[PDB]
Amino acid sequence: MRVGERFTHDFVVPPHKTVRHLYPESPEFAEFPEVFATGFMVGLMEWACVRAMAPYLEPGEGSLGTAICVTHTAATPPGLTVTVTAELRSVEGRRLSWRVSAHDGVDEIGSGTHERAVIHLEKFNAKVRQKTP
Amino acid sequence: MRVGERFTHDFVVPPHKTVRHLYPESPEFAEFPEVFATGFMVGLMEWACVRAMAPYLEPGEGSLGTAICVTHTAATPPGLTVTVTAELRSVEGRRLSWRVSAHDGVDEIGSGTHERAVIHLEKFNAKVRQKTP
């Protein structure tokens, strides 16, 4: 991969990626319109960047999303295709940053940046076990 | 609403709020350690802000998330209690910005800002239906 390169990730929004599906536990949500949740959009942006950086990982490595900083300016009902465009902003050792944007074929729905960190998966897993009840 | 107003809520992370649950579709995320997804943390942070604003909305009003800008620097397995605090930092027109932070009892897991917009609900819903394939 190269800095300034763009990677695209296409995802048709299904009925189960709406606000109420992010937190079915939430009475305060279950009257939101049936639209693509910001939290799901963040996940889609991470997923796009994960794919983009795959040819960069070595065996035994994964990555974490360590920062997300984006707008969400238009709502997307199920049925539309959301395309995330990830542009590599920098890569240095275990750190990588991306400019991200998303569009649903009708509106640009949001944009900003995302940062990820390469991790040793097994080391990470162990750390998580150290926190597990 | 008064700048400085804070609201806090607690959330025991259940098994179905891990990364693999945000996007089961992702062959990529299926691999992943069983930790609270960034997207779910964002939703919990938005949920805090939604609750904090509710008392001040007139009938027929709702709000939409318009920006999220957070770090997520420590991972959380199911079973831990995540505490989210939201503090109103600014109000301008129909828009409110909150300082948000989350802690799982061991680590501060993320922090940053979230912006929302107060909207006319019905109008918004109609617009969504008009954008629906």
Curated annotation (Swiss-Prot), chains A, B:
UniProt keyword Hydrolase, yes or no: yes
Active site: residue positions: T38, E46, H72
UniProt-reported outcome of changing L22A: Reduced activity
Keywords noted in UniProt: Hydrolase
Database matches in PANTHER family: BLR0278 PROTEIN, THIOESTERASE DOMAIN-CONTAINING PROTEIN
Subunit (UniProt): Homodimer.
Name of the protein this chain belongs to: Fluoroacetyl-CoA thioesterase
